[PDB]
């Protein structure tokens, strides 16, 4: 059935507006992470922004045209240090998966928009992992564990692929001469 | 000391020529992986190409100008299916870390170019992991394990971040509606 005049129609636009802003915020935080010397985290922010772009696209495609007025609150700023940005980002993700999406999904179901409700619920799952990443990285920064660990492990240079074995990433990559900022724990997800 | 007239000078240019070609090949293979429905693998090819760009840059910066003639053999083609491309790529990486770089490093040491020799050796380490990734992915394709595993696990949509729990990736992402091609095993390297 058509969405015209429904609460779900406005909820979709509200979600689209929020996700659009989140995309920008995450890209800015990504740039700041770069300046703060956290390349992996910078790329994580950039990827999250791209994924918010996709959540927004799915939502946008449900709309059927025309200008619609919405009333909603959003983060008025700001760009701080990377740890602070990760904390604020996690809080935003938390709101989305614990409050916004579940509420929007329930209303969608109430109004008879099952497919849309399922999409809202599905997006919430992605947001929960987004929060996890942001919280995990914030914790690594706070504990001084971004580039140094208790036991020896493997570190990979994101710039050239060099693999370093040790308790911590080197000050300079011996292969490409790029700074420690480019290193991450070697990951294998396959 | 200057590199002029040394064998190391020509070895550096030879490595630069090969790495430059590898960058192109990997980008083309990345495009083919996309067409074959392997997004994670496509992005892996693209990242490897970018890293070859960086190995090449480090090498390029050692040179001191002028045109230099080199005699070397390179892969004359070709672009095939993704499994075949992964196999050929791994073979190329194998040559680089087992033959080319170690030989170039030894000669560099022999001619008194210690720093350059260390860089050759360091690049070799990155290439060995490049081969590992290519071989692991080729094996996943051959065994039909790219999108399906024996026990239930977590799969992540690279397009939107949705997380799916099950023995295999879904045909369609319930959040962004993108095809199975976008899924990968959920990874946590932090
Ligand atoms: Fe979001
Ligand atoms: Fe999110
Ligand atoms: Fe490096
Ligand atoms: Fe290479
Ligand atoms: Fe390589
Ligand atoms: Fe998705």
Curated annotation (Swiss-Prot), chains A, B:
Binding site for Fe(3+) 3: 157, 160, 173, 176
Residues that coordinate or bind Fe(3+) 1: 19, 52, 96, 127
Keyword DNA repair: no
Residues that coordinate or bind Fe(3+) 2: 52, 93, 127, 130
Main location group: cytoplasm
Subunit architecture: Homodimer. Possesses two rubredoxin-like centers and two non-sulfur oxo-bridged di-iron centers per dimer.
Name of the protein described by the UniProt record: Rubrerythrin
Chain's gene name: rbr
């Amino acid at each position: 059935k058509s969405l015209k005049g429904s609460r779900t129609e406005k909820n979709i636009l509200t979600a689209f507006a929020g996700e659009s802003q989140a995309r920008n915020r995450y890209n800015y935080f990504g740039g700041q992470a770069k300046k703060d010397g956290f390349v992996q985290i910078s790329d994580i922010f950039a990827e999250t922004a791209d994924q918010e772009r996709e959540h927004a696209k799915r939502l946008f495609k449900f709309l059927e045209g025309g200008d619609l007025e919405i009333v909603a609150a959003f983060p008025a700023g700001i760009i701080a240090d990377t740890h602070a940005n990760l904390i604020a980002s996690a809080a935003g993700e938390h709101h989305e998966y614990t409050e916004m999406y579940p509420s929007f999904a329930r209303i969608a179901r109430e109004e008879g928009y099952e497919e849309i409700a399922r999409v809202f619920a599905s997006i919430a799952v992605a947001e929960e992992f987004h929060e996890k990443r942001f919280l995990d990285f914030a914790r690594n920064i706070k504990e001084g564990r971004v580039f140094l660990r208790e036991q020896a492990t493997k570190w990979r240079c994101r710039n050239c692929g060099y693999v370093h074995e040790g308790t911590g990433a080197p000050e300079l990559c011996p292969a490409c001469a790029h700074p420690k900022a480019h290193f991450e724990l070697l990951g294998i997800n396959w």
